[PDB]
Assembly symmetry: C3
Homo-oligomer: 340 residues x 3
């Protein structure tokens, strides 16, 4: 909600309360999404200032607060700054922002990140370009310098984050993307390569001096319809865990496919049919292994901009015989949302 | 403070800064409330939306920020989401909300949780129903479907939270409550039973396949007077610690009594006289043990809705000879509050 | 930004997004400021209420959110409440506030804490009086009871914080300060003494039953000019680490000197020339050791109250041969700020 606007500075303070539960049999140690309470809160600010006519300065910070911890010691778990950045919109020339942000690859995969609860499984955190990373300078251009309508690109720069964990680390990298949006239709291309950290390289799973993530996208956003498809391929790039031998690291190569079909009904209900499969070719010890394999049945009922309840249900195509030992049970997710 | 209201959505953003100190002799390792700096901050949102005339959607998130940590490593301690939920108010039919929230039992014990600083000692966090728990679906009804004025109930559903700690865990449970409020007078009844987690059952202290919490309440809220009484009984339900043998778990049974007397003076000062005693019958190794035993002398001076300073002083009726080894010294608490 | 004002209560909700990077060679394990992503967010409230004409109640809470963590486990690092307090402004008689706050000494050292990114190196957290501490009651007086224009003092009371760490701990103490501000010119005096905690005393580095911090200040705030000088001396007061023998504690004595020269250009750019040197006399094992020794070249470009980018560059006068083993390389800092 816009809670400030004077002298050309406008500040939006927004949040939500998403009382949420997940439903699976057993512990759900072996289901897709887990089992039990999953409630969370968000709060953040989109700020924006006009420096002149030709110039606009902005900044954003969003934070995940978890509602499923006891007020004791586990009190802090899964709390995080999801976004924190700042930039300058120059008239027609462009827009530059540094901070923690979505990587250029997400300019593509984002398409199929539209399910009520789940979906967007290839969009990992601190996975170079496919999700939200820290230390990303991005230059984005709208309408090719204002000359070609709906033709947009972005060129991104990733800054070596050497962390205590290989999963969360990353080296120096570069990336880009181009999307063209002719009349409800949008097709996206996106690519990023990165140096790997020496800790990532001294992993058991994964082999290369370089991680790579590229994805193509297609969508139809019109007439209350959402159709979207995604094809991606990660090289030494997606993170994985042998749950049997308790081993960690990266998949040498992945081919990933995500498809979403959604229609928005007038009265509110937004039914959702989707599919997601990621598979890792040539993993060490195991060969070819599925990570994510499921069909999606779900419906968000919107009451207005602020209120909604959703049912999201992942029919898991993973068989119990999983070689990386992923979950094979189904996960039903039910939620009630107040956003502002 | 209400910081947004347009198009039928109203958002309240509220917080406080409570510079607070506690006063006890020695380390106060043996006093009632501790000793030293106790300053904290709160921030949260009560949001509310009108879906139509007959329908209202809401959500809340409140967060405890601690002010007594050094900016180093201890920086995060005692930080927590206290509330995070969402629900639907249907006209006269009712109101349903899931999330982290106060348990139905608190519909009773709440009465005597009115002291400036202390009091409400039987209202534990993640203690099933007596305080704030995670994963509670609640259906509350006002005025018995709008037919009997001031006659209210609630039926609650608790969702198995299997956690790393027995103190913080809990299984599947159900609860309810009825309160009737005839002219300043209010009498409450409240009951909840729950399955226990296998970790809770493999505790040294406590024995049963089930925890139980019921409490009765009475109050007089009128003429600047607050009188309230509470009688409760927890079965395998209240948590406790043998500080001698460093043992943990639950009291087999507790009888708990809380009484508050308060008058509000015109100019501002709200003097407060109160008493609280919890005792655990049939604890393992120890027999009958007092947990909380004290008298309360205190006064909140209110300047307005936003400003206040309070003195709260707990004369501790625990004798030094305590068999669970509780604190026996008095604790003086002084505070200065800016809320909004 | 002021987001609430009705019925005499005014509430400011303010924050920022500071996408920030630091530039150093090697790991920068040996540079002045580190190397890599350094983005952070802040959010807090300055609230204020009028109790009558003669009386004003206030409260503040500010919080540091870090933007450079992966969304995993390192997710929480360097998060902290920086301020959390409350107080009463009585007409001409004065103003009293308890909570977590800047210590009276900071009433002096504050002067040279004006660099774009760095500077103010002697202003440590939970270092008694020189920075932000927890459990400080402060009485501040403006214009000597409204009788001598621009003549101000403060008398402060520090409350024993016995913590898990000596670095972060502190005992019972008292402090004060007087500053007089004749026409752009301001000269400050400030002093504080404190009992030391037994854990601090059982440190290898440092010797005394008492820590002391006093600092003098001078400034010229006029005509778009900022000149300021600081002289300080800490006794058993500044914290330090032998990185060779991995030893911790306090410098027996420090003399500290900070100087800032800044001019504000009309169009926006604020160039900044500065210097900072702290040295510890009579440290155990080592003798005399420099802690901070550098020159400061930098420029904040302001677009308006909300937008800015800065370059800050510390030419490090520490030679590689450091006896406490401090960093000796230079650190370039680049940042982009949205505040509100
Ligand atoms: C206030 C608020 O946050 N409301 C809200 C409700 C339901 C939502 C979202 C917001 O979307 C953001 C979800 O945050 C998860 C990060 O986004 C993401 C990244 C990678 C893969 C999948 C992701 O989204 C999950 C589902 O988002 C769709 C709607 O969920
Ligand atoms: C902004 C703000 O929080 N102001 C404030 C000042 C003084 C208060 C309260 C709020 O009440 C909420 C206190 O939070 C503790 C949770 O409530 C609770 C649970 C169980 C037992 C006792 C409890 O309250 C402690 C005292 O509350 C009375 C007024 O305190
Ligand atoms: C919204 C926001 O916080 N904006 C902002 C941008 C740049 C800044 C500051 C704020 O100043 C506050 C910096 O916080 C650090 C605490 O202050 C401090 C203490 C001790 C020594 C040095 C300090 O300041 C560092 C630089 O501050 C100057 C401007 O930085």
């Amino acid at each position: 909600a816009e809670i400030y606007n004077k002298d050309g500075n406008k500040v939006d303070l927004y949040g939500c309360a998403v009382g949420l539960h997940y439903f699976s049999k057993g512990n759900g140690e072996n289901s897709y999404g887990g089992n039990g309470d999953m409630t969370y809160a968000r709060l953040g600010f989109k700020g924006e200032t006009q420096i002149n006519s030709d110039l606009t300065g902005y900044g954003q910070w969003e934070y995940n607060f978890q509602g499923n911890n006891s007020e004791g010691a586990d009190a802090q778990t899964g709390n995080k700054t999801r976004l924190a950045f700042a930039g300058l919109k120059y008239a027609d020339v462009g827009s530059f922002d540094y901070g923690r942000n979505y990587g250029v690859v997400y300019d593509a995969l984002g398409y199929t990140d539209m399910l009520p609860e789940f979906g967007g499984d290839t969009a990992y955190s601190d996975d170079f370009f496919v999700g939200r990373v820290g230390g990303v300078a991005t230059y984005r251009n709208s309408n090719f310098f204002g000359l070609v309508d709906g033709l947009n690109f972005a060129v991104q720069y990733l800054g070596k984050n050497e962390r205590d964990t290989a999963r969360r680390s990353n080296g120096d990298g570069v990336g880009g993307s181009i999307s063209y949006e002719y009349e409800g239709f949008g097709i996206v291309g996106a690519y990023g390569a990165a140096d790997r950290t020496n800790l990532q390289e001294a992993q058991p799973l994964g082999n290369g001096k370089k991680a790579e993530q590229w994805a193509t996208g297609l969508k139809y956003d019109a007439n209350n319809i959402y159709l979207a498809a995604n094809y991606g391929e990660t090289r030494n790039a997606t993170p994985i865990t042998n749950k049997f031998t308790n081993t960690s690291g990266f998949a040498n190569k992945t081919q990933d496919v995500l498809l979403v079909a959604q229609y928005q009904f007038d009265f509110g209900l937004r039914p959702s049919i989707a599919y997601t499969k990621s598979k890792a070719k040539d993993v060490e010890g195991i060969g070819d292994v599925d990570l994510v394999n499921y069909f999606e049945v779900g419906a968000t009922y919107y009451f207005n901009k602020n209120m909604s309840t959703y049912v999201d249900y992942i029919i898991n195509q993973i068989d119990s015989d999983n070689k990386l030992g992923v979950g094979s049970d189904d996960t039903v997710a039910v939620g009630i949302v107040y956003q502002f």
